[PDB]
Structure formats: structure tokens, C-alpha cells
Amino acid sequence: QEFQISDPMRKRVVAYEYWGFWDIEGNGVLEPIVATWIGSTLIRLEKNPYP
């Protein structure tokens, strides 16, 4: 519970990820997306990369 590395570039911070379908264009067609956020910051948001 208490372990912390000295160097901040090696600190471990919990992150969340979301895999799901969304209607990106509002047209009624659902498409897969991926989104990653830490805390209250949305750091990445894009379509599904895997073929």
C-alpha cells in the first residue's frame, strides 16, 4: 500500500480504459471506440486499432 519509487517518471498510477460501441456521427450507426482517462483527464480517444 505504501511503496513509492523516488523518481516520478517511474511512479505507478492507476489508469482506466473503455472499450465499447458508440455512434460517433449521430447517424444511427454504431462503431467501436477506445478511450483512456486518468483521474479527471482524458488522455486518449480514438477508434479501434485492431483489425
Partner: protein, 84 residues
């Protein structure tokens, strides 16, 4: 705004979905914890402590799973190649 899509999801919608899905997951995990408790002899499994009597409990579930582990792991490790 990260991208150029017409409809942007935003964090609030995603967190609404998470907070909707969470109650079922929390109710589910209690059963998993109970099964692990039966396996490892903790929680409800552990016998009560009495000063003048024993508190031993032989491990049945652990034993039954102990042969199954080695029975199942072997076919995946029989050859140098894994995929055909």
C-alpha cells in the same frame, strides 16, 4: 475536444455507464471471494478458536483442485511448438 467527430462522448457519459454497471459487479465479486475463502480456509471457513479444544480443518476443495491443475496444464506443454 480531442477529435473531430460530430458527437463527442465526454468523460461524464462513460462514468455514468461505469456507475450503472458497478452494482452488479460488486454483488458478483462476493461469490468469488467466498469460493476463494473455502479454498484457502479463511473467513467463514476457518474454525472457531476454543481454549481447550482443536481447530484443525482438512482441506478438501484444495485437494480436489490440486489434481485438476496438473491434469489440465500438461497438454499445453507437451511439445516445443504450441500452435498448429
Amino acid at each position: 475536444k480531442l477529435t473531430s467527430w460530430k458527437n463527442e462522448l465526454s468523460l461524464q457519459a462513460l462514468k455514468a455507464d461505469l456507475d450503472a454497471a458497478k452494482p452488479s459487479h460488486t454483488a458478483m465479486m462476493i461469490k468469488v471471494k467466498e469460493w476463494n475463502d473455502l479454498m484457502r480456509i479463511e473467513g467463514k471457513a476457518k474454525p472457531p478458536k476454543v481454549k481447550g479444544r482443536s481447530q484443525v480443518q482438512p482441506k478438501l476443495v484444495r485437494r480436489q483442485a490440486e489434481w485438476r491443475y496438473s491434469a489440465l496444464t500438461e497438454p499445453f506443454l507437451g511439445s516445443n511448438k504450441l500452435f498448429k
